[PDB]
Amino acid sequence: AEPEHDQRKRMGLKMLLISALLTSLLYYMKRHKWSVLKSRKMAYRPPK
Amino acid sequence: FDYLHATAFQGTALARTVEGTTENIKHLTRADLASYIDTHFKAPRMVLAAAGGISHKELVDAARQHFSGVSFTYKEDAVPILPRCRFTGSEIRARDDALPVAHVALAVEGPGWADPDNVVLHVANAIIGRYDRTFGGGKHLSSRLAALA
Ligand SMILES: CCCCCCCCO[C@@H]1O[C@H](CO)[C@@H](O)[C@H](O)[C@H]1O
């Protein structure tokens, strides 16, 4: 019914590995860049 | 420029205004004012300079005459080395849309007086030069940044 079966699971593996690693990486870079904002500090200093 | 310094160095001596805080000015004392001169205006840390119609000799003497107060210990002979300041890639943005125009200062950490490259760096700055709306060369100026401006 599904000759592929095997090769498909062999893929799932490869996919899970790349996946996990590449998501981790991206997550860093996302944070990294965004840091600039999340670290940001602001003050309201009028002239009074 | 002040704000520039204040973030460029932040948490270091260089990140301070030369005019000082508003508080400090309000409360500095006959005391501290003394102390500065006291601790800071000292011979080794000074240079008597002159140029014009004067002979080194004559000058040098007058100095020998008023620049008295000889140092006892060795501390008074020691030139205090300053704790260096940390450069920090960052920014500070003071927004006021009621301000007619806007100012922007961008910079990188420098090498310090000593380093020779300071010369090159200058040669560079010479290429990007400077400009104000009254330069006459206008669109023909040589500084690419100028022209475009
Ligand atoms: C999130 C993105 C995941 C991409 C995962 C790439 C997986 C593709 O991997 C595939 O595995 C098969 C089985 O061995 C091979 O026959 C194919 O040639 C190979 O390209």
CATH number at residue A11: 1.20.5.100
Count the neighbouring beta carbons within 10 Å of the beta carbon of residue B85.
16
Question: What does the alpha-carbon distance between residue B87 and residue B73 come to, in Å, rounded to a whole number?
Answer: 36
CA-to-CA distance for B16 and B86, rounded, in angstroms?
A: 13
A4, A6, A9, A14: which to mutate for ligand 1, most atoms within 8 A of CB? A14
Looking at chain A, how many residues does it have? Answer: 48
B102 DSSP 8-state letter: -
Q: Is A16 in the pocket of ligand 1 (CB under 6 A)?
A: no
Q: Please, are residues B1 and B18 in contact by the beta-carbon 8 Å criterion? A: no
Whether the CB of A17 sits within 6 Å of ligand 1:
no
Number of domains in chain A: 1
**Single-letter code of the amino acid located at B147:** A
- B81 Cβ neighbours under 8 A, 6+ residues apart: none
User: Atom 5, ligand 1: which residue's CA is nearest?
Assistant: A15
- Three-state DSSP state, B41: coil
Query: Which domain range does residue A11 map to?
Result: 4-48
Find out whether the beta carbon of A11 lies less than 6 Å from any atom of ligand 1.
yes
- Which runs of consecutive H residues, i.e. helices, occur in B1-149? 2-8, 22-27, 30-40, 56-66, 118-128, 144-148
> What experiment produced this structure?
X-ray
